[PDB]
């Protein structure tokens, strides 16, 4: 275990842990609450690099976390979707990918049409599914 501890292991192992990566993603001991505590101008070059790094920290976290909210998966770490898998994406079989490719390799295998999957993802799970209440919310 550890942060990215299973980065080189098979995809089945990264499926098993996963939180250790998600936990250490927003806040860090490195930030350490700023201030010297314990000259009186904090306009130094260091303060500029820190604050612009604290911004992109939450700017990149919220850019990805906004994606989880529009897919109905905000509350959980792994959610299933109602989008069928299209064979043009990969020809490999069920146990052939989860035990032989590792995630590091997999991100390069879908990076071509990865944005296209994201487009179809907002539709089937939250554009129609959240709409389907119309008939079932009350009759």
């Amino acid at each position: 275990l550890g942060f990215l501890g299973a980065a080189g292991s098979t995809m089945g192992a990264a499926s098993m842990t996963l939180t250790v990566q998600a936990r250490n993603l927003l806040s860090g001991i490195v930030q350490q609450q700023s201030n010297l505590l314990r000259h009186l101008l904090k306009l130094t070059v260091w303060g500029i690099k820190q604050l612009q790094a604290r911004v992109l920290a939450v700017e990149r976290y919220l850019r990805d976390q906004q994606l989880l909210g529009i897919w109905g998966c905000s509350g959980k770490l792994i959610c299933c979707t109602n989008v069928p898998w299209n064979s043009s994406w990969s020809n490999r079989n069920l146990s052939e990918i989860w035990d032989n490719m590792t995630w590091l390799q997999w991100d390069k295998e879908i990076s071509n049409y990865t944005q296209i999957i994201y487009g179809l993802l907002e539709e089937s799970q939250n554009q129609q599914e959240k709409n389907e209440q119309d008939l079932l919310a009350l009759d």
Partner: nanobody
Framework: EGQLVQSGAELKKPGASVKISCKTS????????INWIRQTAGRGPEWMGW????????????????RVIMTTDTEVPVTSFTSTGAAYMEIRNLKFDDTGTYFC????????????????WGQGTLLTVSS
Amino acid sequence: EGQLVQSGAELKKPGASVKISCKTSGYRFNFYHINWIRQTAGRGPEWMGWISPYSGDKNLAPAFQDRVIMTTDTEVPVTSFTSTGAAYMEIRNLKFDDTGTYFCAKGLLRDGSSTWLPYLWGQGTLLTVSS
């Protein structure tokens, strides 16, 4: 995906002994197992043993675990996902019944349900144990 090629044609007198080699490429040599199977003239291909390039735990068949000891060195990376490696196999005391064709083949998968079976096979080596 990478042609594991076996270097062979080495053949000697009965009981002399010999070591065979198989050069790999086109795959992460680190964590796929490598197996050894032969077919003799009296048919019936016989699996010799499997060995893991990581850690090094091996389980060879009981019929050859007293006279066959196989070892293998490390690999040099080419990219993040490919590498080149090689495997060796040592045998001791042989007769005409040990004559035949010998294959080395890459273990199928990197998981726990089934790996000990080969997947991609070497070009094969013809051994002659003739007097």
